[PDB]
Design a protein around this ligand. Structure first.
Ligand SMILES: Nc1ncnc2c1ncn2[C@@H]1O[C@H](CSCC[C@H](N)C(=O)O)[C@@H](O)[C@H]1O
Ligand SMILES: Nc1ncnc2c1ncn2[C@@H]1O[C@H](CSCC[C@H](N)C(=O)O)[C@@H](O)[C@H]1O
Ligand SMILES: [Mg+2]
Ligand SMILES: [Mg+2]
Lengths: 213, 213
């Protein structure tokens, strides 16, 4: 219907730490991109799009916590949230990201973070490893929402190549850093190969998304 | 009915800062006493007890934010939350409390705190001053809930003497530090004068409360 709006509004403030790199916040994506995530998850639920949710690149887990919280707000107990990451930060330019591997947040730490919100339950599953190792054989069957938040070309490509085919029609692909060259080049390069023409919608001049036909 | 439970459960975690003297948390009273506050406010709303809510001794405002949030969760737009404090900390043993006047939190700071939760609106009113100055002529007409969280004898007495008479029947008096001698002596001394016999219920070995007949 549009349930538990107060809960979800407070949660966005909390996950971005507007109440008290973010320093302590559980997501780095900000309120505008969390609003996009809510719009997509809510649309999939109201439209009946089948499948799980997945984020490739979770850091402290905030965005994934949020998707799990939307399911909780709507009483959907069937869908799963896949929390997919190395849990060691970025792999070894490209833009030299491993330097800053306090993008490295352990599985233990992410698990604890979910538990802080009372959301560490059967509807959350973790897939630890480098995407190139883990996604070709991922135990994911179908997705209604696919969120990409690995910055690198390779991370973005490996996620799209392996998980886009599992995305249901009417499902969403969310590209958190579409305007990052590297991420952008993968998305266009991937779209060109498979002849994907669904239009890309801007979110906030950083992230972008599209909906499958 | 029992509305917005997820919201209120998250709020308690947030106000006590279990997500990320408390250091940054907006209340020092802990989850057990916030649960008591919710039980009392909810009972008053379901029973039809008329009146506003008031806390004498607010620090960073957390408990008052919570009462305002319960009204929000239940859609009650008529009741007011009175936020009553010096906004300069404790007055000048008794237990030498003014030493620690980083119990001193300005009105500006408390106002900002409410706004962080999106709850700084027409249903919240501030009464700045020493209780001995402000309560004898308080613009409060009736109360359904009266929360005392000034530690001192004088603070507790001044609050009871001036506000208890405005407490509706079936309304609650909450004593946050009943087991503090000073606070306790005022409560018993006040109860003995007016012949109040409604029994005191423990909350958590620290706070206590009773319900008016
Ligand atoms: N090839 C790869 N394999 C596994 N994890 C990867 C990866 N490339 C990037 N990552 C992960 O991607 C994440 C980027 S940060 C994404 C975090 C953001 N707060 C959010 O709310 O999503 C890091 O956690 C990093 O470990
Ligand atoms: N006589 C008095 N007049 C006005 N304020 C008083 C007072 N005696 C104590 N106070 C106030 O009482 C508060 C005690 S701390 C209460 C805070 C607690 N977190 C809560 O959530 O309620 C302080 O903010 C202090 O300024
Ligand atoms: Mg990103
Ligand atoms: Mg107290």
């Amino acid at each position: 219907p549009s349930q538990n709006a107060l809960y979800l509004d407070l949660l966005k403030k909390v996950l971005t730490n507007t109440i008290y790199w973010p320093t302590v916040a559980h997501t780095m994506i900000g309120l505008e991109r969390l609003d996009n995530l809510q719009h997509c998850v809510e649309a999939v639920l109201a439209d009946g799009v089948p499948g799980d949710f997945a984020e490739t690149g979770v850091w402290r887990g905030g965005a994934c916590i949020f998707m799990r919280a939307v399911l909780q707000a709507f009483g959907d107990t069937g869908r799963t949230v896949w929390v997919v990451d190395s849990f060691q930060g970025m792999p070894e330019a490209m833009a030299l990201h491993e330097y800053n591997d306090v993008l490295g947040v352990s599985l233990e730490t992410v698990r604890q973070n979910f538990a802080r919100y009372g959301l560490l339950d059967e509807q959350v599953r973790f897939l630890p490893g480098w995407f190139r190792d883990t996604l070709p054989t991922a135990p994911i069957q179908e997705l209604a929402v696919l969120r990409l938040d690995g910055d690198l070309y390779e991370s973005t490509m490996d996620s799209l190549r392996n998980l886009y085919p599992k995305l249901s029609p009417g499902g969403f692909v969310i590209i958190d850093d579409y305007f990052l060259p590297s991420c952008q080049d993968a998305v266009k390069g991937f779209r060109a190969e498979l002849g994907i023409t669904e239009p890309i919608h801007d979110i906030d001049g950083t992230g972008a998304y599209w909906r499958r036909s």
